[PDB]
C-alpha cells in the first residue's frame, strides 16, 4: 500500500505550517557522529585541509509523530531533507562553503524520528606543517549551531571515537587518531551554554 | 495525436501524488550499466581520478502504466527526469560532486518502465601509482542506494562488462579491463542485504 504512506506524508507536511524552530520552552537535542572517509588534499601555502566525511545527525521533534496502525502499520519512511526542518550544524573554521557529495534524504520514524547522513567535502583551517614527519599534525574543526544557544539546541555525541572503518585504504594520509568530543562554553557576560562538538584528527603522509 | 500525448502526460503527472519511494512491502529493482568514455585526469598529489561515463539506469513502476488504446496507440514518451521520481544511486567514494554532461531526460513505456542515461564526470578516490608501468593500475568505485537497503531497492546488472565500444581512442590513459560486478553485503547486527554495483577499471598510459 503506497496509498497509506502518501496519506501520512500529506497529513504531516501539507496542512500544518512548517515547524518554527527550537524555542527555550521546547528545546531539542541533536546527536552528531562523523564517519571520516578521506584526507584528500593539504595546502601549505594557505593552511587549509580538505576532508571528505559522512556527518550523521539525529534530533527529535513532536510534529512528526503518528501511530503506525492508523496508517497501516508504517513506522518509518524516507523523505527529502527539504521537506522537514533540519538543524544548522555548521563547521566554524570552514573556508569554502561545503559541497554535498550525497543525496539529502532523511528517514523518519513513528516515534517522530529523523535521521540524516549527508556526505560532504569540507575545506577548513588547519596548519599542516610537520605532516611529512613520523609525528604527524593535528587539526581541529568544531561543528555547532550558528544561531541557537545551548538552551534551545543541545548536542550529544554517541561515541567519542570517529568511525575510521571506511577511510580510503590507499589515501595519501594515514590517520593516527580522531575524536568527536563535546565541548561547552560559558562567557562572563552571559549565563547561557554555548555547545559544540570538536573533531580533532592526527594524520601524516603514508610511508 | 500530440493532443493524445499531452493528454497522457497530463494524466500521469498532474493527476496524482508523487510516488513516495519504494518500501519493504512494495520494493523495486534498478538495472545499472556503465558505458565508459574517457579517463580524463589523474593526479598523484591527491589520489583522485576523473571519469566521464554514461550510466544507464532502468526501473519499472506500476503508477506509470497506461494502456495505449486509451491514448491513441502511444507506447513511450520522453519527459524531463524532473517530472518523475528517480533512484538514489550514488558513487560511494566520490570526492567532488558529479558534473552532468548531458540533458536529464528519461523515456517511459506503457508497461511503466523508464530508462534514463545521464552522461557524467566523476572524481573519485584512486591511487594512480604505477600508471606508466605496463601492469597499469586498478581503480574502483561502488554505486548504490544512499538510503534504501536491499529490501527496498535491488540492483542488477545485465552484463558485467563495462561498455568500451565508445572509449576515446586518443585519451591519455587506456582501459585494460572494466567490470560491473554486483555485490551483496550482510553484517551480523542486521538482517538486511545491502547491495552495490562495484565498478573496477584497470588502465595504463599509451604504450
Amino acid at each position: 500500500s503506497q496509498a497509506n504512506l502518501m496519506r501520512l506524508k500529506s497529513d504531516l507536511f501539507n496542512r500544518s505550517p512548517m515547524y518554527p524552530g527550537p524555542t527555550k520552552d521546547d528545546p531539542l537535542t541533536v546527536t552528531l557522529g562523523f564517519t571520516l572517509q578521506d584526507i584528500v588534499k593539504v595546502d601549505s601555502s594557505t593552511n587549509e585541509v580538505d576532508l571528505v566525511y559522512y556527518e550523521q545527525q539525529r534530533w527529535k521533534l513532536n510534529s512528526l509523530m503518528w501511530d503506525p496502525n492508523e496508517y497501516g502499520n508504517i513506522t518509518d519512511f524516507r523523505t527529502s531533507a527539504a521537506d522537514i526542518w533540519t538543524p544548522d550544524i555548521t563547521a566554524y573554521s570552514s573556508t569554502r562553503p561545503v559541497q554535498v557529495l550525497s543525496p539529502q534524504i532523511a528517514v523518519v520514524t513513528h516515534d517522530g524520528s529523523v535521521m540524516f547522513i549527508p556526505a560532504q567535502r569540507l575545506s577548513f583551517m588547519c596548519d599542516p606543517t610537520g605532516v611529512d614527519s613520523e609525528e604527524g599534525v593535528t587539526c581541529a574543526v568544531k561543528f555547532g549551531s550558528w544561531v541557537y544557544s545551548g538552551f534551545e539546541i543541545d548536542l550529544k555525541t554517541d561515541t567519542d571515537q570517529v568511525d575510521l572503518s571506511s577511510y580510503y585504504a590507499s589515501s595519501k594520509y594515514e590517520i593516527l587518531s580522531a575524536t568527536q568530543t563535546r565541548q561547552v562554553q560559558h562567557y562572563s557576560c552571559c549565563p547561557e551554554p554555548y555547545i559544540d562538538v570538536n573533531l580533532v584528527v592526527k594524520f601524516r603522509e603514508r610511508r | 495525436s500530440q493532443a493524445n500525448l499531452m493528454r497522457l502526460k497530463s494524466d500521469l503527472f498532474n493527476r496524482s501524488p508523487m510516488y513516495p519511494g519504494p518500501t519493504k512491502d512494495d520494493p523495486l529493482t534498478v538495472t545499472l550499466g556503465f558505458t565508459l568514455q574517457d579517463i580524463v585526469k589523474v593526479d598523484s598529489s591527491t589520489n583522485e581520478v576523473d571519469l566521464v561515463y554514461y550510466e544507464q539506469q532502468r526501473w519499472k513502476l506500476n503508477s506509470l502504466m497506461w494502456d495505449p488504446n486509451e491514448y491513441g496507440n502511444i507506447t513511450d514518451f520522453r519527459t524531463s527526469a524532473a517530472d518523475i521520481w528517480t533512484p538514489d544511486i550514488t558513487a560511494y567514494s566520490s570526492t567532488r560532486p558529479v558534473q552532468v554532461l548531458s540533458p536529464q531526460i528519461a523515456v517511459v513505456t506503457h508497461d511503466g518502465s523508464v530508462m534514463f542515461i545521464p552522461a557524467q564526470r566523476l572524481s573519485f578516490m584512486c591511487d594512480p601509482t604505477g600508471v606508466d608501468s605496463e601492469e597499469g593500475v586498478t581503480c574502483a568505485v561502488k554505486f548504490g542506494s544512499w538510503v534504501y537497503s536491499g529490501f527496498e531497492i535491488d540492483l542488477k546488472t545485465d552484463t558485467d562488462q563495462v561498455d568500451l565500444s565508445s572509449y576515446y581512442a586518443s585519451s591519455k590513459y587506456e582501459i585494460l579491463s572494466a567490470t560491473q560486478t554486483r555485490q551483496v553485503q550482510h553484517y551480523s547486527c542486521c538482517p538486511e542485504p545491502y547491495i552495490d554495483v562495484n565498478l573496477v577499471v584497470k588502465f595504463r598510459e599509451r604504450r
Partner: peptide, 16 residues
Amino acid sequence: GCCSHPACAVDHPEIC
C-alpha cells in the same frame, strides 16, 4: 560495522 555505511545507519537508530 554498520555505522560506516549510511544506508545501514539510517535503518538502525537502534544501534547507530
